[PDB]
């Protein structure tokens, strides 16, 4: 009798992610391709009170990660304050630091302390938890090699706050393209440090972008193999979102 441990159980949270054979790199640029060249109606057809929408997406991966007690929190690119202001209605707004570029409006408590700085900058430093929500999409005009860059040189920034002498004891990083060489390098390197970490789909996220997130739960490697899942089962469930079956029927 297994008992009350089934409600810890993924459930509708995130996608089941099995390792399977494949180079993420190459089906990764494919399923981009692919999307950058769907007409208005596919990529439509495909693509479907708090500060953001942020707010019950980090309350999904805090349950996912058993309600642990944050204590001191950055909030990096927090943007609007989804997130903080989630942090400060669990614990209140003492314990946190929101760092972000605005000039995005704050729409969270104002007693929240902010840095306006570019996460690349600040030197890091000692948390409880560290909270990352950065990364971008690029437009379908650009090089994905572009793409991939720009997110890659984004991590290298949270590189440094998991490094450090006593790592973030929680941690939610959000991996906007994670299946680069870089993302998954990286991703590898802090389960090593960390001891710790899943990477991790939510459910009911959109199939127009491929983030995950990488989590302060109980280890879960073979990383690569899960992010070739991931990014296989995301191109046929964009194949199939974006027909128009013919019937046939
Ligand atoms: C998608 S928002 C995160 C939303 C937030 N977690 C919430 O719940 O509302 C990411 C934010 O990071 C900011 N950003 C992008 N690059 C940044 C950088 N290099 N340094 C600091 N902030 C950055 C952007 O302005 C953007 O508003």
């Known amino acids: 009798p297994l008992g009350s441990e089934v409600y810890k159980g993924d459930g509708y949270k995130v996608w089941k992610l099995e390792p399977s054979l494949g180079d993420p790199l190459e089906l990764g640029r494919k399923t981009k391709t692919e999307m950058n060249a769907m007409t208005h109606d596919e990529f439509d057809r ?3 009170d708090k500060p953001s929408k ?12 058993d309600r642990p007690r944050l204590g001191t929190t950055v909030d990096l690119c927090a943007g609007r304050g989804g997130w903080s202001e989630l942090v400060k209605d669990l614990e209140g707004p003492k314990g946190i630091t929101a760092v ?20 690349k ?47 973030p004891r929680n941690f939610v990083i959000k991996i906007q393209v994670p299946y680069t060489q870089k ?16 990477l991790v789909r939510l459910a009911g996220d959109r199939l127009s972008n491929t983030v995950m997130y990488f989590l302060s739960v109980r280890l879960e490697t073979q990383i690569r193999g899960r992010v070739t ?13 974006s027909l128009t079956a013919d019937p046939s029927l």
């Not at 942020?54 to 990660?65: E, Q, S």
């Not at 899942?229 to 979102?241: G, I, N, P, S, W």
Request: aromatic content about 10%; glycine content about 4%.
């Open 121 to 167: 900058h600040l030197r890091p430093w000692q948390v409880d938890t560290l909270l990352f929500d950065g990364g971008e999409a690029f437009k379908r005009d650009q090089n994905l090699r572009k793409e991939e860059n720009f997110n890659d040189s984004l991590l290298d920034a949270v590189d440094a706050w998991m490094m450090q002498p006593v790592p």
């Open 54 to 65: 942020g707010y019950d997406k980090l309350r999904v991966l805090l349950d996912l990660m």
């Open 46 to 48: 495909m693509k479907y």
């Open 229 to 241: 899942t991931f990014v296989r089962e995301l191109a046929e469930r964009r194949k199939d979102r």
């Open 183 to 198: 993302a998954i390098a990286l991703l590898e390197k802090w389960q090593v440090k960390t001891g710790k970490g899943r």
């Open 100 to 119: 972000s570029l605005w000039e995005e409006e704050w729409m969270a408590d104002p007693a929240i302390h902010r840095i306006n700085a570019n996460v």
